Amino acid sequence: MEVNQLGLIATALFVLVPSVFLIILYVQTESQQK
Amino acid sequence: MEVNQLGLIATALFVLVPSVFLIILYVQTESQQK
Amino acid sequence: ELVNVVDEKLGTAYGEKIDLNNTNIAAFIQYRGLYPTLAKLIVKNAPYESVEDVLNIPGLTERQKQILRENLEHFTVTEVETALVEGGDRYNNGLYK
Amino acid sequence: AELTPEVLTVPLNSEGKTITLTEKQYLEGKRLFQYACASCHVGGITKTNPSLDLRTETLALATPPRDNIEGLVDYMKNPTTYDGEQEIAEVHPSLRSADIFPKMRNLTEKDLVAIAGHILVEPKILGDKWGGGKVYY
Amino acid sequence: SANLWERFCNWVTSTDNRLYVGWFGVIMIPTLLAATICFVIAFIAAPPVDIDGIREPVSGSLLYGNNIITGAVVPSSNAIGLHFYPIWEAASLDEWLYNGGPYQLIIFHFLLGASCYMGRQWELSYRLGMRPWICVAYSAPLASAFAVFLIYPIGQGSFSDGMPLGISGTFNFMIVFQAEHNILMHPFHQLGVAGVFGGALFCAMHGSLVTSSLIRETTETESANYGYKFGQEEETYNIVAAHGYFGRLIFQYASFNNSRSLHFFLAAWPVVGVWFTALGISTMAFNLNGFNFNHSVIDAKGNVINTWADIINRANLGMEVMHERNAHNFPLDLA
Amino acid sequence: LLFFFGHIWHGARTLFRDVFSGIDPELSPEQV
Amino acid sequence: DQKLGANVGSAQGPTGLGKYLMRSPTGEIIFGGETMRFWDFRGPWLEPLRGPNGLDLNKIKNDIQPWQERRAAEYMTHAPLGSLNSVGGVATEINSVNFVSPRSWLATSHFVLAFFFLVGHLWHAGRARAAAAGFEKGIDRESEPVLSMPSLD
Amino acid sequence: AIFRFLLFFQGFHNWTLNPFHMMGVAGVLGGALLCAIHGATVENTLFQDGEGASTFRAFNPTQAEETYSMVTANRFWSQIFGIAFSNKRWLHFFMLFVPVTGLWMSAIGVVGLALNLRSYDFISQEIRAAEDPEFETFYTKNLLLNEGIRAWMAPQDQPHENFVFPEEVLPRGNAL
Amino acid sequence: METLKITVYIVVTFFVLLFVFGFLSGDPARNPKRK
Amino acid sequence: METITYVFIFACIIALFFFAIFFREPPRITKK
Amino acid sequence: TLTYDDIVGTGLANKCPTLDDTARGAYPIDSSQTYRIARLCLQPTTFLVKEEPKNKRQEAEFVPTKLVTRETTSLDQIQGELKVNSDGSLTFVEEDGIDFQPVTVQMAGGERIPLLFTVKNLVASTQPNVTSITTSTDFKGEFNVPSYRTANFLDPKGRGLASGYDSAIALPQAKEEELARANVKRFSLTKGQISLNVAKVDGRTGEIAGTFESEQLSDDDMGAHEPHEVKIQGVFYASIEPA
Amino acid sequence: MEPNPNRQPVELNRTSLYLGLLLILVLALLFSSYFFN
Amino acid sequence: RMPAFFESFPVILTDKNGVVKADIPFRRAESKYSFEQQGVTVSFYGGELNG
Numbered sequence A, B: 001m002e003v004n005q006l007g008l009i010a011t012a013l014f015v016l017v018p019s020v021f022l023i024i025l026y027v028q029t030e031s032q033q034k
Numbered sequence C: 001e002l003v004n005v006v007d008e009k010l011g012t013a014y015g016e017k018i019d020l021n022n023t024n025i026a027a028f029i030q031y032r033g034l035y036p037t038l039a040k041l042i043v044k045n046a047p048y049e050s051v052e053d054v055l056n057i058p059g060l061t062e063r064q065k066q067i068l069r070e071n072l073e074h075f076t077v078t079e080v081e082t083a084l085v086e087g088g089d090r091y092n093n094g095l096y097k
Numbered sequence D: 001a002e003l004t005p006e007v008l009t010v011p012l013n014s015e016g017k018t019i020t021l022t023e024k025q026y027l028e029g030k031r032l033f034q035y036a037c038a039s040c041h042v043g044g045i046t047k048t049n050p051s052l053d054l055r056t057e058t059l060a061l062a063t064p065p066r067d068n069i070e071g072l073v074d075y076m077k078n079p080t081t082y083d084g085e086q087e088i089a090e091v092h093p094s095l096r097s098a099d100i101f102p103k104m105r106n107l108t109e110k111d112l113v114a115i116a117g118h119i120l121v122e123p124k125i126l127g128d129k130w131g132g133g134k135v136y137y
Numbered sequence E: 001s002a003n004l005w006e007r008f009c010n011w012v013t014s015t016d017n018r019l020y021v022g023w024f025g026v027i028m029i030p031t032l033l034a035a036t037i038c039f040v041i042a043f044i045a046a047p048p049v050d051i052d053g054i055r056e057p058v059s060g061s062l063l064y065g066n067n068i069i070t071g072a073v074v075p076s077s078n079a080i081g082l083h084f085y086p087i088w089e090a091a092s093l094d095e096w097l098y099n100g101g102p103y104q105l106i107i108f109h110f111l112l113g114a115s116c117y118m119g120r121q122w123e124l125s126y127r128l129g130m131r132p133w134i135c136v137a138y139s140a141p142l143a144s145a146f147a148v149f150l151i152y153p154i155g156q157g158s159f160s161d162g163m164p165l166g167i168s169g170t171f172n173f174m175i176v177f178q179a180e181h182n183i184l185m186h187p188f189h190q191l192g193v194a195g196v197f198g199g200a201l202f203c204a205m206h207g208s209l210v211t212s213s214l215i216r217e218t219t220e221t222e223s224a225n226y227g228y229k230f231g232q233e234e235e236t237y238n239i240v241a242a243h244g245y246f247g248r249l250i251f252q253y254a255s256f257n258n259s260r261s262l263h264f265f266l267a268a269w270p271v272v273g274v275w276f277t278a279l280g281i282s283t284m285a286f287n288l289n290g291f292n293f294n295h296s297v298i299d300a301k302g303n304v305i306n307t308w309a310d311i312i313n314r315a316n317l318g319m320e321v322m323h324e325r326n327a328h329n330f331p332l333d334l335a
Numbered sequence F: 001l002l003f004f005f006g007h008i009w010h011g012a013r014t015l016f017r018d019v020f021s022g023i024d025p026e027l028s029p030e031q032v
Numbered sequence G: 001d002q003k004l005g006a007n008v009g010s011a012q013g014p015t016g017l018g019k020y021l022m023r024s025p026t027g028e029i030i031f032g033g034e035t036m037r038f039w040d041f042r043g044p045w046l047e048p049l050r051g052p053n054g055l056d057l058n059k060i061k062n063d064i065q066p067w068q069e070r071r072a073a074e075y076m077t078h079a080p081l082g083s084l085n086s087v088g089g090v091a092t093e094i095n096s097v098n099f100v101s102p103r104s105w106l107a108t109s110h111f112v113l114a115f116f117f118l119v120g121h122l123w124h125a126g127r128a129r130a131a132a133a134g135f136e137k138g139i140d141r142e143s144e145p146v147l148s149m150p151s152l153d
Numbered sequence H: 001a002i003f004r005f006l007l008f009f010q011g012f013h014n015w016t017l018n019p020f021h022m023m024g025v026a027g028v029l030g031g032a033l034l035c036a037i038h039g040a041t042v043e044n045t046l047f048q049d050g051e052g053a054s055t056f057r058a059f060n061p062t063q064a065e066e067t068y069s070m071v072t073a074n075r076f077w078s079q080i081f082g083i084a085f086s087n088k089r090w091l092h093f094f095m096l097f098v099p100v101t102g103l104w105m106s107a108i109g110v111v112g113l114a115l116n117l118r119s120y121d122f123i124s125q126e127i128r129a130a131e132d133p134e135f136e137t138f139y140t141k142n143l144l145l146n147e148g149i150r151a152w153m154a155p156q157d158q159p160h161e162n163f164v165f166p167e168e169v170l171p172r173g174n175a176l
Numbered sequence I: 001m002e003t004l005k006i007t008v009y010i011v012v013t014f015f016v017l018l019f020v021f022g023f024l025s026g027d028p029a030r031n032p033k034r035k
Numbered sequence J: 001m002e003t004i005t006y007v008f009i010f011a012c013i014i015a016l017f018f019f020a021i022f023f024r025e026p027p028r029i030t031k032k
Numbered sequence K: 001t002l003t004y005d006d007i008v009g010t011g012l013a014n015k016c017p018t019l020d021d022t023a024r025g026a027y028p029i030d031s032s033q034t035y036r037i038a039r040l041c042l043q044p045t046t047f048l049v050k051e052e053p054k055n056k057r058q059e060a061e062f063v064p065t066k067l068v069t070r071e072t073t074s075l076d077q078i079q080g081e082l083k084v085n086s087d088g089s090l091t092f093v094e095e096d097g098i099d100f101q102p103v104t105v106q107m108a109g110g111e112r113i114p115l116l117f118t119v120k121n122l123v124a125s126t127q128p129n130v131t132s133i134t135t136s137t138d139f140k141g142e143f144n145v146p147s148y149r150t151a152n153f154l155d156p157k158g159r160g161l162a163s164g165y166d167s168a169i170a171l172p173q174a175k176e177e178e179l180a181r182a183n184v185k186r187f188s189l190t191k192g193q194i195s196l197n198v199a200k201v202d203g204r205t206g207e208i209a210g211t212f213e214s215e216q217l218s219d220d221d222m223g224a225h226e227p228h229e230v231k232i233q234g235v236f237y238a239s240i241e242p243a
Numbered sequence L: 001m002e003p004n005p006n007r008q009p010v011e012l013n014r015t016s017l018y019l020g021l022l023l024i025l026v027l028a029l030l031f032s033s034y035f036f037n
Numbered sequence M: 001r002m003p004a005f006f007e008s009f010p011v012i013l014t015d016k017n018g019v020v021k022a023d024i025p026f027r028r029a030e031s032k033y034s035f036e037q038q039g040v041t042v043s044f045y046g047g048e049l050n051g
């Protein structure tokens, strides 16, 4: 339709970036010995 | 100019996704005890 | 309407015969004894209102006038076209072999 | 597919009479044509004035007619403009100007005849190639 | 102070610097920063350049409609030829950017620095007690930049004929070159591709032979790489097993067993080949071009019998006849 | 065409599982 | 073309720059075309046409001498363009005129020699410096210099 | 007969502008670098195991110690280039990878040229060139070189097509 | 603009001097052994 | 929009360069 | 007197000669003796480009601009007869000479404005009754301004007027009405106004000097876009002789 | 250099990952409409 | 017709025997077959432009 061109990328990075953040931590936590 | 609308998001995810991959590993490696 | 004056010129006498008012000088090399001397005079001597006016170039020796008379059937004449005359394009239009 | 004496039969003078060259003259002309012409007439064109070529038809409409042994020969001795209304021996190699164009000093009437024969024989073999330029290479 | 200058010279020359700023470096570091900084700005924001001196600006920067692949830094004007065009030679920058001034500022500083970069590849080797010659391997790629950025222009009479600084701009340099010199048909270029093809070939040979004949010291589920520690005494692969395999692939005497002779060959080949390729461009810079076999084979009557050499000429004419549309006014292309 | 490479890779890795990880000792070569 | 009645001084070429004569960057009148890059050429045959401002439109207009016309023609048809197998002309030319300017031969041969010699220089100089200090045959297994230097890390 | 294959691909497929051909060359060109660079690094980083100048004989065909200072090499490049190897096992695997990957990519590009699915043009560029006659990039320039290659070659290069291109239809710049 | 020329010139002289007076400073000396 | 994307990636590669040269894993000898 | 070498590279070659502060005399006209101009010369000093008042017609003025090309601006070697007229006036009529030079200037925005600074077919005139040429003896007249680029010029996509492509061959199945203007090349031809007002005479040698002001249109680029109005101010030098 | 003694390890449990993601995703479901506007 | 190989192709017109009778010229300077000089015309049969 007649939507915003950047809407897609704004929504994509809005989800990816912080999700990628959490995930990087959780996995580095999860793999800490003992 | 008269470029492709998806070009931006195609380039963004093409860089982010795999970079985010490596990074998740490196950090989880890096934080392994010993 | 925008039209390519040159491609349009090719639908007139120019395009069928040597145009005394537009056609480039080298065109005269396709008929006996017109090239060097006469072609220069013809071109050098501005436009013509009718093919015969060529017979009137000042100085033309009686023999030259003879030759000209012979080849008139190969000439015509049309409005002077700038795109074809400007730039001295009638002495060298950038075409060689 | 060969250079038969049939192909080496070119017009001698204006009154139709012909002459027949021999495989020796031909080659010899071809060699002489390279020695004193190719420089500027390579492949039948004319580098210092692309408007006039050596195509037989071009030489036919020349003035006087230069499309026969007699013609070309005269030319190589006393060159003129396409209308013949002006002698150019001063800026074109010729016998009457060998002091200025040394390459033309050796050249003897025998040689001039060969060069001339070559010019009429080439287009007979090459055809369109001989006259035109890079378009035909 | 043991003496400032005495000290300075000890630092510069110090082999304890993360990056060895040498004596050659003192010239390198600045020239290279100028070349790089000017380029990056040019490539991104420079305006159109009248490369062919015919007032027909070719814009080659990102902000002016180009993308990474098309964009480039355009060569100085042809109106300028081989004349020196330093910024202080222009009434204004506007004038300097229009005649392609940035190009010279870049090529000159780069070529200058890239040479010192060679001078440095020697110096450090000296301060470290290692044999020289590495810098001599780097003389090949350098001798090329030189050939493509300076010799060719000197030879041809203008910097506007030097290779542009961009992807597509380079393909242009190539396609046209071929048309005016028929390089593919020149011995030196061929030696060039032998060296490059060969190099990549050998690079793969060595690489595989060695990697395939490594002594086992790793687990089944452990990177085979860990089987090596920085600062080892003995070798990490069986060069005798390597030679054993390769000698059987072809035949023994046609295989290396001397690691030193192997590695000399490994370096000698590409460097020698590229040296010739660089001499090719530096040679065709004076119009001594490739073999011209046009209309060689002709038949019994005199007809011209074409060879692939001729099909190549047509493709070349297409390039000749179409490059620089509006720049020619006469029959022969002598420039 | 890409899968061909996979075949050549996995196949090799099956017929040389033993020598995977590296090789070892002796010096036999020319002399059956 | 001037003989065909063309006014060289005011002739306008495709780009609007001047088919036969144009101006150099500092104002002097020079020949037009790609030849604008060689406006620094000076030569016996061409000088008598030069004025205090470069090519003089009056001399060009009626002082051109025949010996010059044929000199220009000679030199035009003997430019230093040719192939390895000695076929004078442009790479797309035809066989016939076997010629390659002595200036091309000399210039190339000597650039190659000049070059390789610069490699020769680097090579023999690199050897001399290692020879002097004395390591042009290898790093002393025992005293390996690098091993006595702090880790840049 | 192979050079025309090259010229053809430029002229018809505008192959040089293909992402895969580029990777191709980056690999072959980059592979011929590792080759040269590694070779020289070894020959000028050698230990002295002989008393001669011609150090070739000084080599132990029978392993034992590393014949060149891997430790010195590391420091050299680490100071002149900033980056430097330090794991011969990787340095050598890298050498297999670079040129083999390059050629693989150059192949895919061609597998695509089979269907003529080339990387011929940039649409945004063409559109601006149509509307605006003063826009000129080194790209547009090239495409014109292609037109000439195709027009002047096609005739004697594709005989079965009995091509006849009148002199007037042949694209050509001024004078040439 | 005539200034920039001056400055550039100065700047290049500095470095070029630093360069000559550098190798002049007994460079052969600087190296592992024999000096 | 495109210009920005091209410059960004470039700027990212230069950043990488920096970290790679100045923040590599110090290369340690023998012990490992 | 300076030979060629005495000027080469100085830029001096692009400067019309000058008369000294002395030479402020007057040259006589026999009116019964034909005269000609052995050498007219025009040197630009400024190029002003009238700005388009945007949609809001508010009256537009001329603005200075930077010369992006270099010192290649001057017109020299102009020549023709300076016929005396019945009413005692003088009209110069050019025949031949370096009567045009392609100039390119930039603007506030960064826009390059190319023009074909010329005076081709000049027809300058003076006041009626002009027995002797005194300081400030106005010359005014028109000239022709031919298309910037000539018939053979090809655009980046191969399209041309006298030659080149017929259309946007890069877009084989696109609608054409929109591309019309850029595929069909038109050759523009227009008139120009100039006025040479004397400042220094020198009846002795018959060589007058002064300043000029001319107006003309700039390149319309084979008629792809509108031409800009240009004003040009500079100085001139003429050599009058009986002949 | 001396191993800086002011550093501690960082942690994110599985539940936090989930609570985190639930928030990111839903905010995205809430704002995408206005981004596409 | 346009062979698949060609991105762009010239307009050339020939009769049954394959003789070039008309075309669209590049350099008009010496065109012998311009649609203008030949009075080329076009007629349609069946379809939108039929008749």
Ligand SMILES: CCCCCCCCCCCCCCCCCC(=O)OC[C@H](CO[C@@H]1O[C@H](CO[C@@H]2O[C@H](CO)[C@H](O)[C@H](O)[C@H]2O)[C@H](O)[C@H](O)[C@H]1O)OC(=O)CCCCCCCCCCCCCCCCC
Pocket: D034, E187, E190, E191, E194, E268, E269, E270, E272, E273, E292, E293, E296, G084, G085, G086, G087, G088, G094, G095, G096, G097, G098, G099
């Ligand atoms: C890592 C280590 C790497 C080491 C690499 C080492 C590389 C070494 C390269 C060494 C030498 C290159 C030498 C070039 C010699 C050129 C000789 C020549 O130009 O001679 C020119 C002559 C003449 O050619 C003739 O030219 C002739 C005519 O010219 C003319 O003559 C006519 C009358 O006779 C007319 O007058 C005419 O107008 C006039 O132009 C005719 O046209 C003939 O038909 C034509 O055949 O040469 C011929 O015939 C030539 C036929 C030549 C075949 C040439 C192959 C050349 C180079 C190959 C390199 C291969 C590398 C492979 C590497 C593989 C793995 C590494």
Ligand code: CLA
Pocket: E026, E027, E028, E029, E030, E031, E034, E084, E085, E086, E087, E088, E104, E105, E106, E108, E109, E112, I008, I009, I011, I012, I013, I015, I016, I017
């Ligand atoms: C570190 C080395 C270095 C080098 C080698 C160069 C070299 C060059 N630069 Mg550059 N530059 C540098 C650093 C360097 N630069 C830096 C850090 C900057 C930022 C300010 C610039 C900014 C810059 C600009 C903006 C420009 C250049 C340009 C140039 C070129 C100018 C040509 C010229 O006329 O000058 C050469 C001058 C000489 C050869 C004369 C020096 C002679 C010396 C050797 C002796 C003088 C005698 C002395 C008085 C006696 C000694 C007495 C003793 C007791 C002490 C040249 C190739 C120009 C260019 O690229 O044009 C295309 C240009 O426009 N440079």
Ligand SMILES: CC(C)=CCC/C(C)=C/CC/C(C)=C/CC/C(C)=C/CC/C(C)=C/CC/C(C)=C/CC/C(C)=C/CC/C(C)=C/CC/C(C)=C/CC1=CC(=O)C(C)=C(C)C1=O
Pocket: E039, E040, E043, E044, E068, E166, E167, H022, H023, H024, H026, H027, H030, H031, H033, H034, H037, H038, H039, H041, H042, H070, H073, H074, H077, H078, H081, H083, H084, H085, H086, H091, H097, H098, H099, H101, H102, H105, J006, J007, J010
């Ligand atoms: C705003 C602006 C300016 C924007 C853009 C500017 C611009 C034009 C950028 C262009 C960049 C670009 C996009 C290029 C396109 C080409 C490209 C990158 C393709 C990538 C994809 C590709 C080729 C995939 C597969 C093919 C492949 C594997 C290529 C590999 C290439 C590669 C990195 C090769 C290595 C080259 C190299 C320098 C290795 C050095 C190794 C090492 C330091 C040697 C020193 C050394 C030697 C020894 O022997 C020893 C013992 C030791 C110890 C030691 O240390």
Ligand SMILES: CCCCCCCCCCCCCCCC(=O)OC[C@H](COC1O[C@H](CS(=O)(=O)O)[C@@H](O)[C@H](O)[C@H]1O)OC(=O)CCCCCCCCCCCCCCC
Pocket: E011, E017, E018, E019, E020, E021, E029, E032, E033, E036
């Ligand atoms: C007209 C010119 C104007 C110039 C102005 C600047 C003057 C000089 C220097 C200071 C400015 C900041 C420099 C940053 C240094 C650094 O990172 O290295 C820091 C290291 C650490 O050592 C080191 O640092 C030591 C001290 S400490 O770690 O700071 O305590 C110090 O004692 C030792 O000598 C030193 O080597 O320094 C070096 O090894 C020398 C580096 C030389 C510089 C390289 C230039 C290369 C250019 C390449 C081109 C490509 C890149 C393009 C990028 C745009």
Ligand SMILES: CC1=C(\C=C/C(C)=C/C=C/C(C)=C/C=C/C=C(C)/C=C/C=C(C)/C=C/C2=C(C)CCCC2(C)C)C(C)(C)CCC1
Pocket: H082, J004, J008, J011, J012, J014, J015, J017, J018, J019, J021
């Ligand atoms: C559109 C936009 C934007 C965007 C942007 C971005 C997104 C960016 C990014 C950026 C980035 C992300 C960056 C980065 C950077 C980096 C850098 C800059 C680095 C550097 C480094 C260095 C410098 C190093 C060193 C060295 C080397 C490596 C080599 C040798 C030499 C030396 C030593 C020098 C903004 C927001 C602004 C706003 C407006 C709009």
Ligand SMILES: CCCCCCCCCCCCO[C@@H]1O[C@H](CO)[C@@H](O[C@H]2O[C@H](CO)[C@@H](O)[C@H](O)[C@H]2O)[C@H](O)[C@H]1O
Pocket: E003, E005, E006, E007, E009, I024, I025, I026, I027, I029
């Ligand atoms: C045609 C033009 C020719 C122009 C020639 C101009 C020459 C100008 C100066 C010559 C100077 C010789 O200058 C002298 O060199 C010696 C090295 O040999 C320097 O001595 C230097 O090297 C040693 C190492 O060897 C350092 O520890 C010391 O700190 C350093 O200064 C002197 O400090 C310097 O003053």
Ligand SMILES: CCNc1nc(NC(C)(C)C)nc(SC)n1
Pocket: E202, E205, E206, E207, E209, E239, E242, E243, E246, E254, E255, E256, E257, E262, E265, E266
């Ligand atoms: C040590 C393995 N043998 C070996 N032999 C050879 N021989 C040629 C001729 C390919 C250089 N090459 C290699 S790889 C550089 N290895």
Ligand SMILES: [Ca+2]
Pocket: none
């Ligand atoms: Ca505007």
Ligand SMILES: [Cl-]
Pocket: E052, E054, E056, E324, E325, E326, E327
């Ligand atoms: Cl152009």
Ligand SMILES: [Fe+2]
Pocket: E206, E210, E263, H038
């Ligand atoms: Fe190796």
